[PDB]
């Protein structure tokens, strides 16, 4: 009666969806063959008369090298042969190449299967989008997918999970260009958008999980752990359930303010887990701590706007009550004056699961935090500073203007981000 | 309810607390794994004093382990009970002090201490009503005496209205294993007296004589010595963990044993120890425990009570007894040894009786005595200090790291008027 559709775009999308769908299979007991060895799988796994459960997602990327590993690997028989679309040439770190020239050729192939999967489900809440800002495919192709899904389906919700470019390190050179030119599209054709930062997960893995040298394979397990904790209200029973509509109305006050931040706690290894008690006050204090936050911004510098708490496991509502009541006493955490009640909670009975060969410990209770705050504009300002000194010498412009767009798109995208920053600080000013 | 935070610093402190938690675990019935294995139900009542319970029914100790070299925590973790300590209580650096008080206090121990206070604050706040602290260290060098006293000097302003135990290892005339031992001990006891509550002196010379004569052993290794003093270490907090008739905690002791704020040095003792060759010969009865506990050869310090007078004494008894045998016997020994007790205070004895005996014995007694004879250690180390300081020896290793010449004179001056205050009661 309820369903969700996931769209994974780019190399980041297809690689963080592999660990995410791996955890979905283990949570419902789905072996990689595609069958069984409760009707909670119907939101994610369809049905067949032979007993086979197939997923309800699409995998879009212009690089066939990373899509073909799903064909070669263990989950070949489980994933649908046509749900995973293959390109021919990559966008090559270019917004112009992925949007105007190549992206128009494969949009009709993707949208045909989006319509087919949407007609499979009787009741659909919305779409979850996993992509990356700095990729050519994750920015160029997504910028037309969202603007075409918005007119194909009017009031369907659009949740986003974006791999945010990092303040210090990155794997690209023109990432400030690809990040700026996609925020014009995502500001108007999206409902809510969470941000994750790669090197922030690096330091969390180093100083909490005690693993010295992490790899993308365990970063995608942490990101896939967050998405499972978000949607676990839909899948499993609880004391009170929270919908995808519920927190998307509790976290945005304005159409221009739709950028919250994600936080997961506790994050600890198997050896360290059994020595200290993990009470509810233990795990809700780490989410409020700026050290455990996985986006490189300090809420101490910023101001809180709204918060959402997602509890899983052996949790009692009374000790939750004492947790927020203790938090509201602290003056280290600062709230805006126009939102005195900025807390929405959610309770789930099922404790989180663990994967074989994983890094996380078997934990009885966990909490996921989705906090909207003003401190993201600190990260916005340090990115457009890098954009402006790059653009002053007209670097890399001929890669974009020779593929089909004009040069005025750079000016209006910077003008929107200047006005967006003006809107963030005006909201932040109290009366 | 009532909680005791244990601090453990130094090489000798790390070796003395490993056997300390071995004795408690056997007393409370805890396996090396960390699960409760006890025949009775009385051992699980007061377990919150030493243990912090974690999920799965596992009890971990609330003790912190700090040192500058990583060579001793490897031995502790490889020990028989090394797996029960939590791995994040292991706080250590990469460079040792190397037998230098100024290294562990001013240039190297001043960096690690910012993390040590953070760890002990994590456990001092998690309890309900903290009773006090308990530190085990030695004065043999600046690794555990340079920073063990500094930890005392940092916690005192953080928690002023508490009680601090310190089971310090004092130097001895013949087991002097450090040429700069008078330097590192005098500089520590200068900073230790004014900001502590109870201090116990445990030197190796008395433990060697007890193992060779009273216990009749041929090989008194360090495992044997640590078990002797850990019996008294666990024997001082029996009333906190087990029910009895005269319940007396560390503070009810400290009011009686400390008449003046600068008189808080005690003489440890253990009564019922006996060699195997006379175990069947000796009648285990409370006149024999009382007659044995007052002998000078049973004392845990190299001081003779025959050269001093007794200020205040306490005895804590373990096991099902009647109490008037000892009440008659400590009245008896007060009358016959009248010349050895000070006459300006009457009733110098303190009685504590607990209903739970130690493991393997019907009874026990633990002797804690504040006596005037302890100045002989202070006179002996002050004379060694003057000889080494009059020729200005070994001063470049201390003055080269931010220590001035006049700080040693203040250390000597506070030592001399401590024993000048101490002398007037003879």
């Amino acid at each position: 009666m309820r369903e969700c559709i996931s769209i994974h775009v780019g190399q980041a999308g297809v690689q963080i969806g592999n660990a995410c769908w791996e955890l979905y299979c283990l949570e419902h007991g789905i072996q990689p063959d595609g069958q069984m060895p409760d009707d909670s799988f119907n939101t994610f796994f369809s049905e067949t008369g032979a007993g086979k459960h197939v997923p309800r997602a699409v995998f879009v990327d212009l690089e066939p090298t990373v899509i073909d590993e799903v064909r070669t690997g263990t989950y070949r028989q489980l994933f649908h042969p046509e749900q995973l679309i293959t390109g021919k040439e990559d966008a090559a770190n270019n917004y112009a190449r992925g949007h105007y020239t190549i992206g128009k050729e494969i949009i009709d192939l993707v949208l045909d299967r989006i319509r087919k999967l949407a007609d499979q489900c009787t009741g659909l809440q919305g779409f979850l989008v996993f992509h990356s800002f700095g990729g050519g495919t994750g920015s160029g192709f997504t910028s037309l997918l969202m603007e075409r899904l918005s007119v194909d389906y009017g009031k369907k919700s659009k949740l986003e999970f974006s791999i945010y470019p990092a303040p210090q390190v990155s794997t690209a050179v023109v990432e400030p260009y690809n990040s700026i030119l996609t925020t014009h599209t995502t500001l108007e054709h999206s409902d809510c958008a969470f941000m994750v930062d790669n090197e922030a997960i690096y330091d969390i893995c180093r100083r909490n999980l005690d693993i010295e040298r992490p790899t993308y394979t365990n970063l995608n397990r942490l990101i896939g752990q967050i998405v499972s904790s978000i949607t676990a209200s839909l899948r499993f029973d609880g004391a009170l359930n929270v919908d995808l509509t519920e927190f998307q109305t509790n976290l945005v006050p304005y159409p221009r303010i739709h950028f919250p931040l994600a936080t997961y706690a506790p994050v600890i290894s198997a050896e360290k887990a059994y020595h200290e008690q993990l009470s509810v006050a233990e795990i809700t204090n780490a989410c409020f701590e700026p050290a455990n936050q996985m986006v490189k911004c300090d809420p101490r510098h910023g101001k809180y706007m709204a918060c959402c708490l997602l509890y899983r496991g052996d949790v009692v509502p009374k000790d939750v009550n004492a947790a927020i009541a203790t938090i509201k006493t602290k003056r280290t955490i600062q709230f805006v004056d126009w939102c005195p009640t900025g807390f929405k909670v959610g309770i789930n009975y099922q404790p989180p699961t663990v994967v074989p060969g994983g890094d996380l410990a078997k934990v009885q209770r966990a909490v996921c935090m989705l906090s909207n705050t003003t401190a993201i504009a600190e990260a916005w300002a340090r990115l457009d500073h890098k954009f402006d000194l790059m653009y002053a010498k007209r670097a890399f412009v001929h890669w974009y203007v020779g593929e089909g767009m004009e040069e005025g798109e750079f000016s209006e995208a910077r003008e929107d981000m200047a006005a967006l920053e003006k809107d963030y600080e005006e909201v932040g000013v109290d009366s | 309810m009532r909680e005791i935070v244990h601090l453990q610093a130094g090489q000798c402190g790390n070796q003395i607390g490993a056997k300390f938690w071995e004795v408690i675990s056997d007393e409370h019935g805890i396996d090396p794994t960390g699960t409760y294995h006890g025949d009775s139900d009385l051992q699980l009542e007061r377990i919150n004093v030493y243990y912090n319970e974690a999920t799965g029914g596992k009890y971990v100790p609330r003790a912190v382990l700090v040192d500058l070299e990583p060579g001793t925590m490897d031995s502790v973790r490889s020990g028989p009970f090394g797996q029960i300590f939590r791995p994040d209580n292991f706080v250590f650096g990469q460079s040792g002090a190397g037998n230098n008080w100024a290294k562990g206090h001013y240039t190297e121990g001043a960096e690690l201490v910012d993390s040590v206070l953070d760890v002990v604050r994590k456990e001092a706040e998690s309890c309900d009503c903290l009773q006090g602290f308990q530190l085990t260290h030695s004065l043999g060098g600046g690794t555990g005496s340079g920073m063990g006293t500094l930890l005392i000097s940092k916690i005192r302003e953080e928690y002023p209205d508490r009680i601090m135990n310190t089971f310090s290892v004092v130097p001895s005339p013949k087991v002097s294993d450090t040429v700069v031992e008078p330097y590192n001990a005098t500089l520590s006891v200068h900073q230790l007296v004014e900001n502590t509550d109870e201090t116990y002196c445990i030197d190796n010379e008395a433990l060697y004589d007890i193992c060779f004569r009273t216990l009749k052993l041929t090989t008194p290794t360090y495992g044997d010595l640590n078990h002797l003093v850990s019996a008294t270490m666990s024997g001082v907090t029996t009333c906190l963990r087990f029910p009895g008739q005269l319940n007396a905690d560390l503070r009810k002791l400290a009011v009686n044993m400390v008449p003046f704020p600068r008189l808080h040095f005690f003489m440890p003792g253990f009564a019922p120890l006996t060699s195997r060759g006379s175990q069947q010969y000796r009648a285990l009865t409370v006149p024999e425990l009382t007659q044995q506990m007052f002998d000078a050869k049973n004392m845990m310090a190299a001081c003779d009570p025959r050269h001093g007078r007794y200020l205040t004494v306490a005895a804590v008894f373990r096991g099902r007894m009647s109490m008037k045998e000892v009440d008659e016997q400590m009245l008896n020994v007060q009358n016959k040894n009248s010349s050895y007790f000070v006459e300006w205070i009457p009733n110098n004895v303190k009685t504590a009786v607990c209903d739970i005996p130690p493991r393997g014995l019907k009874m026990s007694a633990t002797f804690i005595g504040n006596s005037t004879a302890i100045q002989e250690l202070f006179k002996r180390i002050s004379e060694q200090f003057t000889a080494m300081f009059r020729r200005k020896a070994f001063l470049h290793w201390y003055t080269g790291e931010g220590m001035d010449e006049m700080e040693f004179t203040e250390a000597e001056s506070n030592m001399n008027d401590l024993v000048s205050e101490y002398q007037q009661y003879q």
Partner: peptide, 29 residues
Amino acid sequence: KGSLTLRSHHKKYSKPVLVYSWHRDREAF
């Protein structure tokens, strides 16, 4: 490090170990 971030106050213990308000907690049974 990792574990030092999780401070909190109070702790559960178990039913045979008596703590403060162990009387009030046994009484509801």
